[PDB]
C-alpha cells in the first residue's frame, strides 16, 4: 500500500515513440525550474529514469546532468547537481568495470555517483534506477542479460526515491513508447498504473506524427491517466493544428523549434531558444497540480452540501469521515487525505463497493477497453424485438452456465431490484395459470433482502428497517419464516434453530437426516394464497451475512415445488463467484424456476441485471394478446454496455487461465482465506460467530467495539462498511489468497485490542 505525496508535483514523461526527445524536454523543464532569477536553496528538481538500456553508452540521466551544468554556466546561475545509477545488469556494470555482487535476480547495486555541489544553490538530483547494457527493449535486455526486476520492486524503488525527498518538482522519464514493455514484459502504461501519476506526452512532429501522437494519447487515457500537455519538435508540417483541434484546445500543444541534426552540436543555444516553450510547459505542470490539489481539498465539503447519499443519516456525517476516492486499481481505492501531507494512499475495498466488486488490476484494464469499444460500436441500441452481439453472447453465456439444465429464457433489467420485481411478476403468472386464478402472497425467510423498490420490499419481512416512514405503501405481503442458521464458532461449525466440516453441511445426504424430517414438517404445516417462494440461497447478505442451513432451503424448495408454487432464486448477491461457485444451485443441489443476477454479473463495472426463467414460466405469457405479454421494460433494457461487460466477466471469472483461483475441475475457486487465521479469529473472545465461504469473510461481535475496529482497519489500509455488529471482508473472484492472508492478519491483530 503506497503513500504518494502530492505536496509536490510529480509527472511522468511519456512519448509516442522512442527518440522523440523525452530527455530534451525533461532537460528543458529542469533548466526552466532550477535556473530562475532569485536562487532559493529550497528549489529542487528530482529527475528519475526508472528504466534505462543502451547503457552506459546511452544515459539519459548523464545527459540531463551534463546539460544543466552547461546551461547553468551559460545563465551564470549556480546549482548543485548529482547523477547516480542505482542498479545495473552485470554486463552493464563491467562496462563501468565494477566487479560488483549479484542478486538472486541478476541485478547489481552500483556505487556510482557524480556530484558537483554548491551549498545554498537550487538542486538537481538525477537518478537512474535500473540499467541494462543492450540498447534494446527492457523486456528483451532483461532476458539476454539475466537481470530481472519485477514490477512491484520498480514501483517501490520509485516510491522510496520520492518520499526520500519529501520548491520541488519531480520528473519520471519513461523508456520508449507509452506501450513499450518494461523489464518483466508488462507494458509501461500498465506498470505505472497503480500510481496514476499525471503526465505529459512528447509527440511526433514528423510526417505521420499526428496519428502516432493521438494513438499514444489515447492509450494513456484508456488506462485512466491524465495528460497536462503535449509537446513536439517542429518539422515544418504544422502538426499542432490537427492535434489542438482533436484535443479541442482542452490541453496545450507546445511546439519546440527544429533541433540540430549536426551531431557535434551542443544543443545549448537550442535550449536557450526553447526557453519559452519549456517555461510554458513547467507553468502548465505546476498549475495543473495546484488546481488538482485545490479541487481534492474541496471535495469532501462539497459532497456534504451537494450529494444526498443512499442509506446515510446525513446529520451524523461530517467532512472528516467523507472519503475522497481519486481512482481505483483492481481491489484498491486511491484515497486522498489532506490532513495527511496531502497524499494518496491505497485502501483495499473490503466491502467490494456494496458487493459489486471483482476485477484485479489486469482485468480492470481489459474491461475498460472492451467498454470503450462497445461504446464506440453500439452506444445504446433498442432491445425489444432486436438482436445485437453483446446481448446475444451474454444470454448464451448465461444459459450455458448459470442457467444450465433448467433455464431457457433471459430477461434483461437494470439492477437487482428490477430483476426481482420482474421475477415476482413471472412467478405469480405461472402460479395463477396452474391454479386457474384473489390475493397472492409470497413465502420467504425473515432476514432476506431483495431490493429497495416497492415490489422488492413486499417480499421482505416487516422490520423497523422497512415499514411506515420508509415506504407508506409497504403492507407485508408475505408469509415469513425464521431460517435456521449455520456459523463457525470456537473452531467448529454449528447450527442454530456440530458439523464435521463446512462441506458436510452442503452434503446432500442430510436429506436422510432427522433435521430433514423436522424441516419438511415445520414447513409443510404453514404451507390469501402462497404464489411464489423467494430466497437468498446460502447467505442472507443485507440480513447481516448470515449463513442459512442449505438443507433447510432445499427442503423448502422441494416442498413448494410439490405444491406447484414457483421457486425464485435471488442470486443478486450470490451469483458469479461471490461464494466460490458460479451459481448456488451448485451448493443447494437444486434448481429454481426463476433466478436473478446482478452485482458481480457485470464484474463490478456498471449496472445490468438479468432474470432467467424456465420454458414453462415463459409459456404463461404466450397468447394472442399483447396484454398477456409481460409488460415490464426499462428504456435501457439490455444496454450493449452492460451486456458486453457481463459477457467478458462471465468468461473471465470462470476461466482457469484468467482466474488462477479456479479449481482443477473449474467449477469452484481455491480456498482464499487462510485456514489457521480463520480458525483463530473464530475463537477470539470478542467474536460471537464467523461465516466464511468463497470471497466472503464475516464476523459478528458480541456497537462499542464495531466503530473502533472500522477505524483501526482503515488505519491499516482496509476500507469496509459495518453491518450492525457484523464486520466483513469481501474480496473479488480473482483476488490472490496472499492478499486475503494479509487482510485476516491485520484484522486479527486489531481484535487483539479486545482480550
Ligand X SMILES: C[C@@H]1NC(=O)N[C@@H]1CCCCCC(=O)O
70 CB burial (10 A radius; 0-12, 13-18, 19+): middle
Instruction: Report if residue 132 touches ligand PLP, rule: CB under 6 A.
Output: no
Q: What is the largest CA-CA distance in the chain?
A: 98
Instruction: Report if residue 293 touches its own copies, rule: CB under 8 A.
Output: no
* Phi then psi dihedrals of residue 576, to 5 deg: 60, 45
CA distance 733 to 579: 9
- Taking CB under 6 A as the criterion, the residue among 2, 217, 412, 573 binding ligand PLP is 573
CA distances from 57 to 95, 132, 618 (A): 9, 11, 73
Closest residue (Cβ) to ligand PLP?
416
Give me 506's grid cell.
452442503
- Taking CB under 6 A as the criterion, the residue among 181, 447, 642, 733 binding ligand X is 181
Find out whether 24 is annotated in a ligand binding site.
Answer: yes
CA distance 386 to 383: 5
Min dist CB 131 to ligand X, Å, is 8
- Taking CB under 8 A as the criterion, the residue among 34, 71, 201, 365 binding its own copies is 365
Which residues make Cβ contacts (< 8 Å) with residue 139, sequence separation at least 6? 181, 182, 183, 184, 185
**Residue 630 interacting entry, from ligand X, its own copies, ligand PLP, none, C-beta within 5 to 8 Å by type:** its own copies
Report the 10 Å Cβ neighbour count for 708. 14
- Taking CB under 6 A as the criterion, the residue among 9, 122, 176, 531 binding ligand X is 176
Task: Give the residue among 72, 87, 78 at the shortest CA–CA distance from 157.
Answer: 87
- Taking CB under 8 A as the criterion, the residue among 721, 739, 748, 754 binding its own copies is 721
Task: Give the residue among 531, 532, 512 at the shortest CA–CA distance from 520.
Answer: 512
Binding mask 582-621 for ligand PLP (x = CB under 6 A): ----------------xx----------------------
Min dist CB 423 to ligand PLP, Å, is 10
Instruction: Report if residue 245 touches ligand X, rule: CB under 6 A.
Output: no
Residues 441-480 that bind its own copies (CB under 8 A): 451-456, 458, 464-466, 469-473, 477
**Considering only 52-60, 372-380, 536-544, 648-656, which stretch makes contact with ligand X by CB under 6 A?**
52-60
Beta bridge partners of 409: 613
| Strand 253-256 with 726-730, pairing | unpaired
Instruction: Report if residue 319 touches ligand X, rule: CB under 6 A.
Output: no
Instruction: Report if residue 478 touches ligand PLP, rule: CB under 6 A.
Output: no
* Phi then psi dihedrals of residue 481, to 5 deg: -110, 155
Which CB sits closer to its own copies, 628 or 660? Answer: 628
Give me 169's grid cell.
518538482
Find out whether 276 is annotated in a ligand binding site.
Answer: no
- Taking CB under 6 A as the criterion, the residue among 90, 197, 267, 572 binding ligand PLP is 572
Find out whether 88 is annotated in a ligand binding site.
Answer: no
Instruction: Report if residue 180 touches ligand X, rule: CB under 6 A.
Output: yes
Tell me if 489 sits within 8 A of 499, measured CB to CB.
Answer: no
Find out whether 69 is annotated in a ligand binding site.
Answer: yes
**Considering only 204-212, 242-250, 300-308, 570-578, which stretch makes contact with ligand PLP by CB under 6 A?**
570-578
88 CB burial (10 A radius; 0-12, 13-18, 19+): buried
Which CB sits closer to ligand X, 54 or 476? Answer: 54
Instruction: Report if residue 177 touches ligand X, rule: CB under 6 A.
Output: yes
Q: Which residue has the cell 446432500?
A: 508
Which CB sits closer to its own copies, 506 or 576? Answer: 576
**Residue 536 interacting entry, from its own copies, ligand X, ligand PLP, none, C-beta within 5 to 8 Å by type:** ligand PLP
H helices present in 511-614, as ranges: 514-526, 550-562, 585-588
For residue 228, the surrounding DSSP H or E stretch is: strand 227-233
Question: What is the DSSP code string of 723-752?
Answer: BTTEEEEE--TT--HHHHHHHHHHHHHHHG
Which residues make Cβ contacts (< 8 Å) with residue 215, sequence separation at least 6? 16
* Phi then psi dihedrals of residue 474, to 5 deg: -60, 125
Number of residues that bind its own copies (CB under 8 A): 167
Binding mask 418-457 for ligand PLP (x = CB under 6 A): --x----------------------------xxx------
Residues 380-419 that bind ligand PLP (CB under 6 A): 415-417
CA distance 716 to 752: 14
Annotated binding-site ranges for ATP:
19-24, 69, 173-176, 233-234, 472-474
Annotated binding-site ranges for (8S)-8-amino-7-oxononanoate:
354-355, 449, 599, 633, 721
Task: Give the footprint of ligand X on this chain (CB under 6 A).
Answer: 18, 52-54, 137, 175-177, 180-181, 207-211
Task: Give the footprint of ligand PLP on this chain (CB under 6 A).
Answer: 415-417, 420, 449-451, 536, 541, 570, 572-573, 598-599, 634-636
Amino acid at each position: 500500500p503506497f503513500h504518494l505525496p502530492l505536496n509536490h508535483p510529480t509527472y511522468l514523461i511519456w512519448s509516442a515513440n522512442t527518440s522523440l526527445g523525452k530527455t530534451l524536454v525533461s532537460t528543458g523543464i529542469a533548466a526552466s525550474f532550477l535556473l530562475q532569477q532569485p536562487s532559493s536553496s529550497a528549489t529542487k528538481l528530482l529527475y528519475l529514469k526508472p528504466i534505462q538500456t543502451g547503457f552506459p553508452s546511452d544515459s539519459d540521466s548523464r545527459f540531463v546532468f551534463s546539460k544543466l551544468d552547461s546551461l547553468s554556466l551559460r545563465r551564470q546561475i549556480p546549482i548543485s547537481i548529482s547523477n547516480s545509477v542505482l542498479h545495473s545488469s552485470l554486463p552493464a556494470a563491467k562496462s563501468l568495470g565494477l566487479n560488483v555482487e549479484v542478486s538472486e535476480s541478476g541485478m547489481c547495486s552500483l556505487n556510482f555517483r557524480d556530484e558537483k555541489t554548491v551549498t545554498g544553490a537550487p538542486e538537481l538530483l538525477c537518478k537512474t534506477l535500473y540499467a541494462w547494457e543492450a540498447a534494446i527493449s527492457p523486456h528483451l535486455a532483461a532476458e539476454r542479460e539475466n537481470a530481472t526486476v519485477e514490477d512491484s520492486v520498480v514501483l517501490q524503488m520509485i516510491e522510496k526515491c520520492l518520499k526520500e525527498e519529501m520548491d520541488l518538482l519531480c520528473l519520471v522519464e519513461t523508456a520508449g513508447g507509452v506501450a513499450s514493455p518494461g523489464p518483466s514484459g508488462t507494458l509501461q502504461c500498465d506498470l505505472y498504473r497503480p500510481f496514476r501519476l499525471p503526465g505529459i506526452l512528447v509527440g511526433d512532429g514528423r510526417l505521420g506524427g499526428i496519428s502516432g501522437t493521438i494513438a499514444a494519447y489515447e492509450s494513456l487515457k484508456l488506462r485512466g491517466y491524465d495528460i497536462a500537455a503535449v509537446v513536439f519538435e517542429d518539422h515544418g508540417l504544422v502538426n499542432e493544428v490537427p492535434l489542438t483541434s482533436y484535443l479541442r484546445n482542452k490541453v496545450p500543444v507546445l511546439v519546440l523549434p527544429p533541433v540540430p541534426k549536426d551531431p557535434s552540436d551542443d544543443l545549448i543555444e537550442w535550449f536557450v531558444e526553447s526557453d519559452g516553450v519549456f517555461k510554458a510547459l513547467k507553468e502548465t505542470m505546476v498549475l495543473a497540480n495546484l488546481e488538482r490539489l485545490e479541487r481534492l481539498n474541496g471535495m469532501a465539503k462539497l459532497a456534504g452540501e451537494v450529494f444526498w447519499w443512499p442509506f446515510t443519516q446525513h446529520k451524523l456525517v461530517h467532512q472528516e469521515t467523507v472519503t475522497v476516492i481519486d481512482s481505483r486499481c483492481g481491489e484498491n481505492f486511491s484515497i486522498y487525505k489532506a490532513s495527511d501531507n496531502s497524499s494518496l494512499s491505497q485502501q483495499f475495498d473490503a466491502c467490494a463497493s456494496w458487493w459489486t466488486q471483482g476485477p484485479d488490476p489486469t482485468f480492470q484494464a481489459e474491461l475498460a477497453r472492451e467498454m470503450g469499444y462497445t461504446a464506440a460500436r453500439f452506444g445504446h441500441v433498442m432491445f425489444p424485438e432486436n438482436v445485437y452481439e453483446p446481448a446475444l453472447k451474454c444470454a448464451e453465456l448465461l444459459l450455458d452456465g448459470v442457467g444450465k439444465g433448467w433455464a431457457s429464457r433471459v430477461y434483461f433489467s437494470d439492477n437487482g431490484s428490477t430483476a426481482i420485481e420482474i421475477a415476482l411478476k413471472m412467478a405469480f403468472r405461472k402460479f395463477c395459470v396452474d391454479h386457474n386464478f384473489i390475493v397472492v402472497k409470497v413465502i420467504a425467510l425473515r432476514g432476506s433482502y431483495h431490493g429497495d423498490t416497492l415490489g422488492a420490499m413486499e417480499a421482505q419481512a416487516p422490520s423497523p428497517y422497512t415499514g411506515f416512514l420508509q415506504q407508506p405503501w409497504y403492507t407485508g405481503r408475505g408469509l415469513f419464516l425464521d431460517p435456521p442458521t449455520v456459523f463457525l464458532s470456537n473452531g467448529s461449525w454449528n447450527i442454530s434453530l456440530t458439523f464435521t466440516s463446512r462441506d458436510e453441511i452442503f452434503d446432500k445426504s442430510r436429506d436422510a437426516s432427522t433435521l430433514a424430517r423436522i424441516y419438511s414438517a415445520y414447513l409443510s404445516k404453514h404451507l390469501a394464497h402462497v404464489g411464489a417462494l423467494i430466497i437468498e440461497p446460502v447467505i442472507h447478505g443485507a440480513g447481516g451475512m448470515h449463513m442459512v442451513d442449505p438443507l433447510f432451503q432445499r427442503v423448502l424448495v422441494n416442498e413448494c415445488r410439490n405444491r406447484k408454487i414457483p421457486v425464485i432464486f435471488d442470486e443478486v448477491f450470490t451469483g458469479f463467484w461471490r461464494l466460490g461457485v458460479e451459481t448456488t444451485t451448485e451448493l443447494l443441489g437444486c434448481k429454481p424456476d426463476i433466478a436473478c443476477f446482478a452485482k458481480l454479473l457485470t464484474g463490478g463495472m456498471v449496472p445490468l441485471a438479468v432474470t432467467l426463467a424456465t420454458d414453462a414460466v415463459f409459456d404463461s405469457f404466450s397468447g394472442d394478446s399483447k396484454l398477456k405479454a409481460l409488460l415490464h421494460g426499462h428504456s435501457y433494457s439490455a444496454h450493449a454496455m452492460g451486456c458486453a461487460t457481463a459477457a467478458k466477466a462471465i468468461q473471465w471469472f470462470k476461466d482457469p487461465e484468467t482466474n488462477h483461483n479456479i479449481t482443477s475441475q473449474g467449477k469452484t475457486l481455491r480456498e482464499l482465506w487462510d485456514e489457521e487465521l480463520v480458525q483463530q479469529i473464530s475463537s477470539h473472545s470478542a467474536v460471537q460467530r464467523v461465516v466464511v465461504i468463497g470471497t466472503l469473510f464475516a464476523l459478528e461481535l458480541k456497537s462499542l467495539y464495531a466503530k473502533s475496529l472500522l477505524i483501526m482497519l482503515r488505519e491499516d489500509g482496509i476500507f469496509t462498511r459495518p453491518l450492525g455488529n457484523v464486520i466483513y471482508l469481501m474480496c473479488g473472484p480473482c483476488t490472490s489468497p496472499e492478499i486475503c492472508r494479509r487482510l485476516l492478519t491485520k484484522l486479527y491483530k486489531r481484535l487483539g485490542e479486545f482480550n
